[PDB]
Chains A and B, each alone.
With several copies, the nearest count.
Chain A
Amino acid sequence: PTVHTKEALGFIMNMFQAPT
């Protein structure tokens, strides 16, 4: 995968796993 994609996927996936 391209670099900006990998950078974007890394930030958003973090959000979808965080405790609440």
Chain B
Amino acid sequence: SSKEVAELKKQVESAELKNQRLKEVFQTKIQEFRKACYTLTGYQIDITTENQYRLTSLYAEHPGDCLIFKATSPSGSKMQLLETEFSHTVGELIEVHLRRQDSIPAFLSSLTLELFSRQTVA
């Protein structure tokens, strides 16, 4: 009713759908970015609850098949592949691309071409 109260009601309204159009814009954009990265690179990339990175291939044979990478160091980005039920099945690719070449891109590339070549058209 009073000017000082009328003004403070505008200020909460303004801050309400300043945060509420902030969340709905983060959400659309994050999902757009993450989806583009799915369709282009053929990996869903999640931040886990342990702040680690989970990768699931578009050509995954089973739906729970995934790779988990931890950020070793804050400074830039080195990453360690952690052990999953699926990482057990690609020791060949780990030896050639992670141990010897020291290239996660080269590894994930090889892995995408190996999984993609298993997809039946039927």
| Contacts from A to B (Cβ < 8 Å) | 2, 4-5, 7-9, 11-13, 15-20
How distant is B32 from chain A, measured CB to nearest CB, in Å? Answer: 9
B80 an interface residue at 8 Å Cβ cutoff?
A: no
Whether B21 lies near A8 (C-beta < 8 A) is yes
A4-B21, A17-B46, A17-B48 known; A12+B26 contact, CB < 8 A: yes
Whether B18 lies near A16 (C-beta < 8 A) is no
Interface residues on B, range: 20 to 34
Provide the residues of chain B in CB contact with A19, threshold 8 Å: 44
| Contacts from B to A (Cβ < 8 Å) | 14, 17-18, 21-23, 25-27, 29-31, 33-35, 38, 44, 46-49, 77
A17 to B25, CA, bound (A): 16
A–B Cβ pairs within 8 angstroms, 9 of them: A4-B17, A4-B21, A4-B22, A8-B25, A12-B22, A12-B26, A12-B30, A13-B49, A16-B34
Provide the residues of chain B in CB contact with A15, threshold 8 Å: 26-27, 30-31, 34
Provide the residues of chain A in CB contact with B47, threshold 8 Å: 13, 16-17
Question: Nearest residue in A to B36 (C-beta to C-beta)?
Answer: A20
